Symmetry: D2
Subunit: 385 residues, 4 copies
């Protein structure tokens, strides 16, 4: 199960380069030079990398240090053939962002957050990124009175509408993806799920420039079904990007490697992405645990990819299995894909078979045969057919 | 703290009339006649009641029994002055709806679910209802392969678009509210939160006819902040109705009386509804616990109202308190309500005070003073000023 | 992957005989005659069945109907070779138990609950049961003031101590297992987890008669790791029985078939049970979903067993894999099984290599190699070696 | 509502001295000198402080720097009258503890963890501490195969048994309290709840030396009822210490000030502690949010105390209220405190009123009147009588 660049696997620089600092402990690993991560990931078979501004250029770097960092990184991309499909901004680490960036109560901070983002959009475009992610990790509150949410949503829409004016006036071909998270590091984060992000999009001045970048474990932090959410984002035509990882239930953000956490959910996610022809990057936003040395970091990264390809093969087997096709029919999945009333409203109202003469008892008595189907899915997932 | 009908408190017939059957136990109370609940609630000071079809007219009633039930109920409404501001359909109890109504895999069942809903919309309009709620409690799955979600969302949009054609072609002044629930009785329910419902609305053919009816405990079943959600629904102009109740965290749907559960959340909810001028009904969808006899059912109902009025008084006190106004200013809530860049994009980009000469350290150092504000909110909530 | 009676698979009568009544819906299946379930499960390869009193003998049956029910059931057990290794009492369905059985506030109800249990212990002993389970599903509260917990725990210990006097004075060879559940149908249930049950046991007059019967999904309802809990119960020598099933996170009790829910957790559970030589029954307390007809009920039951045997084979493969043995050593699992200080306290204190001359940095730098090991476990689980 | 030292309020040095570093951000506050925190808290009315070793003496300090730090701290305690009732060890921050201290897989690390703890027990005893807390924040795993739990529990019991030999052989009057946490920073922590800790205690060689130090938000991280847990620990006679704070449901460890989070739970906690005569310290383990400057840190600390005293007054009012006493009787709380069968087993079995002639229907019909009682509790909590 060997990845190739045609699999479009990507990694954040902050992923394999996580040092292991957690709220109760110090770093357990040395910093990695982004050049060195690009080389190592290229060897493992990745397609590309992603970055926040501050991962690539140390906060408070001069225009000339900034130059030199970008040039070195550009050489590593040239030497390995790695691409940069997505970039993002850090509006969460520096103390100035303690109450948010775009929805900080202090106006001067909201202004600075905009300008910091605009500077990186330009960079992202120079390096060939097609999608620009926004994760408002600091947009939220620990207390009720601290954030008037309606005002916050105004400010949030104001910032996104301004980004969108910028990119339109510059003629850039970059689209935006909002990344929802329900909590952590704030007590409650604004736009906490895929639905909240999707709803909010529809209120921007130019909605066609914005989609979502949902993350497996974030939605699972609210106990939601991640494939269902992704199906809703696909149905809206808004799945611009996706972050893949693992989460063991409702608890702090674990960012385990893909396939770890809820495995069956990983299976139905891959089945969905592949059957709906999602063609974007398969981006891993994971942290190798702080128990690991560098060898462990590379093994965790490889494991991400391996588990995708294994789950890709089993889901493909599932759907090609004639016995599965027969069960899908037994379960009336085919009828679900037929319109309920293509005949129209009037015809429905005049059709006695839909009400006055509908046999509710006999309809009630039909089993759905879902358990047989789900065990077929289990046997395929475990390679036990 | 005495309710009056001008408080617009309402109750579902199914609330006080819950018999106490739970998945592990039999009824502990006798059935109540809807006439008797209307009278008792009128005495307690309620404004009105709501109903599913099947609460009012026993499933499988003739056209003439249906007549007689409606006439008796109409007399009780006339005798007490009670209104019926909202109605809804039961598409969840009968076995025929075991895989859903609008998104059942079997097409014939989807058709019947539509016709059952249309019959009640007419009734609801006769009785003066302004809002028609849809709670798709059976729309969902326990397993991955049983429900193609994109197909399901098609079917769901098809049904709502058809309801909306019906009401438009009949000239009715009724609007629809979708009620989200994340799970139970299905393993995962479609449109599981306020955001998912809001997003979905925007894809209907006539969005202006549809809003949400969020329920305190449902959103809390996914660990979300309910006031934040309600602020988002208000911001979208979609809060058509609201169900009030209590939930003790992430667990089965408790439907405790309003004020029970997360009390501070009830406080910030009331503060929001009242400050934003929500003028709809204050509807309680609660179950008096199965430990209670009829006296207990009426005491629980009264408690719903009492807790609203107590939390209304304390939130009003909070916001009128000059020391609170000073703290809100200390916390820069006023600046949050100012546009980040009314000057426009170009002016922002040319303003050196927003970046090149912005003093990040001194901005970083300013405290937000949120803890002082939140303790003011606590002292007001507890009457300890 | 075919079960045999030597696999010791058992089923509750209430499992396959669940009619599908949930809090929002009516039955979707007809009642099954216990004789018919015994025959069908014997065919599927089960070893035995379990029962509450009230599943076997309808509540309010005469001494003579009681006779006739027991005799018919005894014939089915004789005809099929099925055993009854566990029994239990229903102290949760009848209205009289609305505030509990053993910890009801009303004393007369606590007395009746004892006598109802004692009558069934005798029956259980006649039918050859070795373990008698207690699930206090109604012992708890929705509100703070309703249950003085210290008093409740007195009452709870009083009842168990009385059961234990009864069985000792009768000379029965039956042991008791407490089954923890954190909530549902009460807002909070007493002894909500495995640990709480284990702790409580140690306060009974004869602790050696009582262990736990933990259930996969119950512990997962509190977000706990179920294999860790089971390891603690094994370590205490208290795993007398176990209920196997599936749960998709923190939400209502789903009781999905074994292997559904958190699959990786099912894998590490089976690896534990098998490596520690648990020899008790492998008992499924699941509900076939209400979407299913009778064929679906039997397919769900078979699936329970199949998934156990598949996960048994993969865990066995994992532990026999020399590359896994090498990784376990690489991860110092062997050193974990060595005493930290067999040399004793004084020797530890005098050993400079443990402190004054311990090289913390070089110890810090060693990776644990856990990610490589966990991917080996993943490849074995998926059959991808 | 002014605290005095007779209220026995304490604070960890790490609480008010938290700098605000979270997993996604840098410090927002400067470090505080422990001398300065002792003075400021004494002014606010606290009784005392607690410390980990490493809060007081920087890790890697010489024997002489260690001397000088302790002497300065001792002077501040002398100047203010502050006591040190509890101490603890940091076995979680340094990289060496990445896989735990007492249950690290590497034996040499387990040895060092013991010696680091023993050195501080001596210090704690010199400063007058009566309780020594152990929080095994790093004892656990992210993956199944990394930690054999039975072996881990051996190691855990080995370490505690060794601590207990040390203190017994030195003649110290210090007792140990284990502090449970279900997760974070590990994926699952060993002894994740109050019950698991209580159960484990009973397996130590000298159980009478060990109790629990439960923390409000930790138990709430598993969705448990914290007052119920504390009632169980009191019932076992093991509540040696308690950490008070606030948590908004199942999510990362928030450590909000006491009274924030689940307010009603804070109320029933205080009602319990006060009615059962808990005489230990009322210790706050909270973090002032990172939004706050130093003024905010002191306001948050004061708020902790204020909310305790306000909830102390309301619970006291509740229980003295003759109408509440009447309701408690109406709800048969008095009967719950009476033995179920002081008459004994034989008398129960011979008492026909307990079974053959027990009127189950009439018992079933009695309401428990719990909702009236709970609204009395609400009116008292809000000062609305
Ligand atoms: O979206 C940008 C990335 O920023 C941070 O590292 C967030 O924790 C991560 O989840 C997000 O994916
Ligand atoms: O929405 C209609 C009502 O239907 C059912 O009783 C649901 O449980 C309830 O939550 C919903 O509010
Ligand atoms: O323990 C007896 C059995 O009783 C009920 O059916 C409980 O829901 C089940 O979980 C328990 O296993
Ligand atoms: O127990 C010692 C203290 O150590 C750490 O600061 C833990 O996070 C805290 O919860 C615990 O109370
Ligand atoms: Mn994440
Ligand atoms: Mn991400
Ligand atoms: Mn509800
Ligand atoms: Mn509702
Ligand atoms: Mn269960
Ligand atoms: Mn069970
Ligand atoms: Mn904590
Ligand atoms: Mn603590």
């Amino acid at each position: 199960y060997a990845p190739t660049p045609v699999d479009r696997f990507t990694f954040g620089l902050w992923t394999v380069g996580w040092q292991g600092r957690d709220p109760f402990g110090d770093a357990t690993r040395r910093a990695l030079d982004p050049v060195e991560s690009v080389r190592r990931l290229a060897e493992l078979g990745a397609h590309g990398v992603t970055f926040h501004d501050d991962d690539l250029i140390p906060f408070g770097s001069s225009d000339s240090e900034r130059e030199e960092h970008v040039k070195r990184f550009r050489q590593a991309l040239d030497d390995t053939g790695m691409k940069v499909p997505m970039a993002t901004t850090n509006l969460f680490t520096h103390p100035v962002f303690k109450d948010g960036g775009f929805t900080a109560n202090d106006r001067d901070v909201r202004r600075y957050a905009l300008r910091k983002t605009i500077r990186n959009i330009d960079l992202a475009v120079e390096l060939g990124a097609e999608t620009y992610v926004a994760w408002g990790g600091r947009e939220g509150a620990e207390s009720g009175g601290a954030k008037d949410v309606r005002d916050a949503l105004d400010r949030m829409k104001e910032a996104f509408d301004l980004l969108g004016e910028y990119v339109t006036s510059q003629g850039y071909d970059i689209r935006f993806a909002i990344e929802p998270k329900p909590n952590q590091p704030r007590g409650d984060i604004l736009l906490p799920t895929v639905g909240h992000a999707l709803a909010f999009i529809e209120r921007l001045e130019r909605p066609e420039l914005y989609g979502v970048n949902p993350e497996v474990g974030h939605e699972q932090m609210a106990g939601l079904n991640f494939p269902h959410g992704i199906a809703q984002a696909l149905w809206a035509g808004k799945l611009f990007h996706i972050d893949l990882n693992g989460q063991n239930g409702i608890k702090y953000d674990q960012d385990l490697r893909f396939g770890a956490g809820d495995l069956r959910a990983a299976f139905w996610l891959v089945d969905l992405l592949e059957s709906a022809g999602y063609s974007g990057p398969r981006h891993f936003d994971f942290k190798p645990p702080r128990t690991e040395d560098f060898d462990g970091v590379w093994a965790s990264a490889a494991g991400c990819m391996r588990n995708y390809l294994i789950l890709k093969e089993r889901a493909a087997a599932f759907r090609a299995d004639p016995e599965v096709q027969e069960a899908l029919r037994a379960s009336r999945l085919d009828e679900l894909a037929r319109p309920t009333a293509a005949d129209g409203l009037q015809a429905l109202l005049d059709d006695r078979s839909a009400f006055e003469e509908f046999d509710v008892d006999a309809a009630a008595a039909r089993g759905m045969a879902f358990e047989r189907l789900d065990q077929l899915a289990m046997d395929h997932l475990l390679g036990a057919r």
